[PDB]
Amino acid sequence: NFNVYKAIRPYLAHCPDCGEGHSCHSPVALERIRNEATDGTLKIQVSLQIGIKTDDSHDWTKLRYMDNHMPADAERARLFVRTSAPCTITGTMGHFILARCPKGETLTVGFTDGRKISHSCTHPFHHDPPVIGREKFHSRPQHGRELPCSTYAQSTAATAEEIEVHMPPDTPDRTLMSQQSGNVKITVNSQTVRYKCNCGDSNEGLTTTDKVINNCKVDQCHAAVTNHKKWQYNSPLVPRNAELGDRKGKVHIPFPLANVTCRVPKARNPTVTYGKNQVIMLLYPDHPTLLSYRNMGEEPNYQEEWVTHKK
Amino acid sequence: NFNVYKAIRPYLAHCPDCGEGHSCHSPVALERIRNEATDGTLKIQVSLQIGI
Amino acid sequence: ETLTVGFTDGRKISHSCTHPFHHDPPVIGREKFHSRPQHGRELPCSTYAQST
Amino acid sequence: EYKTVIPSPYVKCCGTAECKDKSLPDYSCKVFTGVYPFMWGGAYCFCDTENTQLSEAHVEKSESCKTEFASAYRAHTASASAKLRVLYQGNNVTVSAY
Amino acid sequence: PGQFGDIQSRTPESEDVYANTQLVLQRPSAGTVHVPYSQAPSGFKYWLKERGASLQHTAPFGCQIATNPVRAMNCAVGNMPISIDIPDAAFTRVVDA
Amino acid sequence: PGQFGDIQSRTPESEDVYANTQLVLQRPSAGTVHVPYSQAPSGFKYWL
Amino acid sequence: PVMCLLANTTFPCSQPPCTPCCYEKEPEETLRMLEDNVMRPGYYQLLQASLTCSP
Numbered sequence: 001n002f003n004v005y006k007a008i009r010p011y012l013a014h015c016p017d018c019g020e021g022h023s024c025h026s027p028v029a030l031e032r033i034r035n036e037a038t039d040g041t042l043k044i045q046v047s048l049q050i051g052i053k054t055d056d057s058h059d060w061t062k063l064r065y066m067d068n069h070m071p072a073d074a075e076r077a078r079l080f081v082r083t084s085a086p087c088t089i090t091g092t093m094g095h096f097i098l099a100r101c102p103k104g105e106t107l108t109v110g111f112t113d114g115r116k117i118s119h120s121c122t123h124p125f126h127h128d129p130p131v132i133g134r135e136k137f138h139s140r141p142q143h144g145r146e147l148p149c150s151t152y153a154q155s156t157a158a159t160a161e162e163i164e165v166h167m168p169p170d171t172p173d174r175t176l177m178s179q180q181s182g183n184v185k186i187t188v189n190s191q192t193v194r195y196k197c198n199c200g201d202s203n204e205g206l207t208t209t210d211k212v213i214n215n216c217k218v219d220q221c222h223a224a225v226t227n228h229k230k231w232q233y234n235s236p237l238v239p240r241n242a243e244l245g246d247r248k249g250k251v252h253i254p255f256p257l258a259n260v261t262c263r264v265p266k267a268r269n270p271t272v273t274y275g276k277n278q279v280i281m282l283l284y285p286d287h288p289t290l291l292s293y294r295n296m297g298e299e300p301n302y303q304e305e306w307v308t309h310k311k
Numbered sequence: 312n313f314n315v316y317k318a319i320r321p322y323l324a325h326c327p328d329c330g331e332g333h334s335c336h337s338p339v340a341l342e343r344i345r346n347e348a349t350d351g352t353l354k355i356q357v358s359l360q361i362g363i
Numbered sequence: 364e365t366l367t368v369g370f371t372d373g374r375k376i377s378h379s380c381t382h383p384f385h386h387d388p389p390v391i392g393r394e395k396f397h398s399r400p401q402h403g404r405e406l407p408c409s410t411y412a413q414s415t
Numbered sequence: 416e417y418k419t420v421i422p423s424p425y426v427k428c429c430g431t432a433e434c435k436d437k438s439l440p441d442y443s444c445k446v447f448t449g450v451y452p453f454m455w456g457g458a459y460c461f462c463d464t465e466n467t468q469l470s471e472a473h474v475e476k477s478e479s480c481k482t483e484f485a486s487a488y489r490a491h492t493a494s495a496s497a498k499l500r501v502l503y504q505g506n507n508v509t510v511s512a513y
Numbered sequence: 514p515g516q517f518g519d520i521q522s523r524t525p526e527s528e529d530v531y532a533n534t535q536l537v538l539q540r541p542s543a544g545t546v547h548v549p550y551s552q553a554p555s556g557f558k559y560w561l562k563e564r565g566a567s568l569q570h571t572a573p574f575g576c577q578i579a580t581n582p583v584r585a586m587n588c589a590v591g592n593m594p595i596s597i598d599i600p601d602a603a604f605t606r607v608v609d610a
Numbered sequence: 611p612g613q614f615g616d617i618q619s620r621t622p623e624s625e626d627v628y629a630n631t632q633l634v635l636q637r638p639s640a641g642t643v644h645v646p647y648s649q650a651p652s653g654f655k656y657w658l
Numbered sequence: 659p660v661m662c663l664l665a666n667t668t669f670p671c672s673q674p675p676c677t678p679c680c681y682e683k684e685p686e687e688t689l690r691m692l693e694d695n696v697m698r699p700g701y702y703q704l705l706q707a708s709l710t711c712s713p
């Protein structure tokens with residue numbers, strides 16, 4: 001088995017709405033919502049890594065997320081996806097979630113963390129699955145016709161589907177530093193720290209142990225944690241270090257799009273009576289059903305209408 | 312009184328959609344939905360036996 | 364079109380109350396949106412402060 | 416369906432970024448001055464106003480294009496073929512022929 | 514942009530892509546690192562919703578339409594000549610009939 | 611079928627019932643034991 | 659056989675100079691040698707070799 005995720009970290013990213021109408025930096029954020037599937041299945045890319053523990057093992061019951069500068073574990077059972085109503089999750093792996101959502105105008109993804117604190121992220125998203133066939137149905141029937149459609153496969157193998165990953169930016173942390181009698185102490189906590197100040201000779205990009213800059217105030221200093229050990233997804237919500245081409249890793253994407261067949265209902269037989277050069281139909285739709293007709297001569301005079309009620 | 316259900320068992324039945332977008336044989340399945348009541352109350356007949 | 368408020372009792376008894384209520388928030392600006400965007404303008408709005 | 420690719424933005428702190436032209440199908444780059452971005456732990460970098468952000472993006476075919484696509488064809492003449500039932504001397508013979 | 518053909522490629526496997534999406538980069542909101550943009554939504558998605566009826570339903574003469582390969586079937590148009598070559602062995606003389 | 615009077619009886623308690631619902635039985639989908647049909651919806655409910 | 663570059667030297671992408679759970683031993687070097695071969699057709703073969711480990 002190949003564990004690519006050992007070299008890939010979960011990350012924090014900006015989220016326009018963290019559930020209270022206010023923006024924040026979240027352990028869960030939506031990078032991209034893919035709805036190419038015609039069966040309505042959504043493929044959601046998130047900052048969370050699902051199925052992978054802080055320890056590099058594929059435990060499908062756990063997800064890992066960032067908590068400040070470290071990954072942390074949480075139960076997958078507490079993961080949810082919602083639009084206008086709760087969605088069914090059809091599989092998860094790494095940064096990707098497959099779900100079948102109810103029609104709605106927003107998408108919310110969230111989870112309960114290891115301290116029983118709720119986290120969620122909501123983005124605007126128009127979700128209105130395309131019609132397969134000539135009938136608009138809300139659920140799969142026991143009896144009906146079968147038509148071609150596209151879905152996201154549950155396979156965890158990839159087929160030329162890849163994401164770019166790169167070395168993450170230095171992470172700013174104002175709790176990383178404090179002022180001790182006019183001398184700012186930089187706490188390392190085993191993570192290399194880069195800092196500089198308005199004070200002379202304050203540029204210390206190689207701090208691996210707790211260090212104090214003397215005769216300097218906390219308001220004069222800036223510090224960030226340096227991490228070059230793991231790759232991070234090339235997200236538009238996270239800055240890069242180099243002017244161009246910091247580095248380009250490639251990671252395979254689970255859940256490829258595939259050709260499958262969808263079940264669709266067949267509208268009830270119409271009641272038909274006849275007149276002179278006339279056919280009279282009484283229709284009994286359960287759900288909006290397309291009616292269309294054409295002449296079989298030179299001029300088909302094609303006409304169509306949607307029928308939403310007995311007519 | 313007496314328990315008529317002691318002579319009757321729960322059963323599995325085909326269900327067109329088990330939530331995953333595909334059918335399965337379920338311990339819970341809908342046989343009939345009755346909506347004659349004008350107050351909007353539904354009576355749902357299922358393969359489950361509740362209270363027993 | 365309705366509003367329901369409730370809680371679980373100390374005896375694990377559910378209590379709820381439902382009233383009719385037309386809840387249809389006014390449009391702020393010239394666009395009808397269902398969630399706040401990552402990018403956009405900021406307009407005057409009235410809210411309830413969390414201050415007690 | 417196309418996907419828009421947006422590489423992580425480059426934030427040059429205490430200096431001005433510049434971008435290069437690229438041959439990518441629909442490419443644009445722009446440098447925004449006066450940026451003061453924040454991370455979860457505080458301001459991204461030391462300088463307040465002397466910062467520039469380089470944003471770039473390009474359009475490319477999505478992975479779905481292997482399955483979900485429309486083909487624009489030029490149509491010419493057509494080859495005709497037919498399946499004919501012939502009752503010959505009392506027997507039913509079906510022949511598939513051009 | 515916003516119309517069928519906004520993104521074009523000669524073949525499914527080709528890396529040669531033409532695109533006209535009017536992709537414009539916008540200034541990020543203050544205090545954030547996101548990259549906003551204004552782009553015309555895929556004309557493919559719009560087309561899929563606005564496709565209308567296909568030839569299978571609109572064609573004259575009651576033609577049935579199928580793909581893979583593209584076919585027009587059972588069109589009630591004009592007529593079709595048939596030439597039949599029948600061997601002498603297949604004929605019975607009137608004296609025997 | 612589909613109209614008021616699709617099902618009729620002389621009295622509420624009568625066992626003499628007329629019905630015209632176009633109850634056509636259809637072939638079951640493969641691998642299943644369900645019994646599909648095409649029947650006009652109650653004309654009483656439509657009437658209501 | 660597709661060859662990958664490490665340090666002004668080349669090797670078959672499936673057979674690195676650093677094989678024995680390379681990422682675990684030298685994760686910084688491992689990521690650097692991978693990124694430099696991103697344009698190589700053997701990149702994924704190298705990626706498999708680099709992050710594959712069996713303790």
Ligand SMILES: *[C@@H]1O[C@H](CO[C@@H]2O[C@@H](C)[C@@H](O)[C@@H](O)[C@@H]2O)[C@@H](O[C@@H]2O[C@H](CO)[C@@H](O[C@@H]3O[C@H](CO)[C@@H](O)[C@H](O)[C@@H]3O)[C@H](O)[C@H]2NC(C)=O)[C@H](O)[C@H]1NC(C)=O
Pocket residue numbers: 502505506507
């Ligand atoms: C030569 O073929 C014709 C046409 O039938 C063709 O060959 C058959 C073997 C089947 O494969 C058909 O699908 C195919 O089109 C024969 O004439 C047809 O015969 C059938 C009976 O065998 C007729 O069906 C009947 O129709 C009546 C009235 O609706 C019903 O009550 C019966 O129950 C049954 O369905 C069919 O209508 C008739 N078609 C025509 C145009 O006459 C023909 O008999 C055959 N000749 C020989 C020697 O085989």
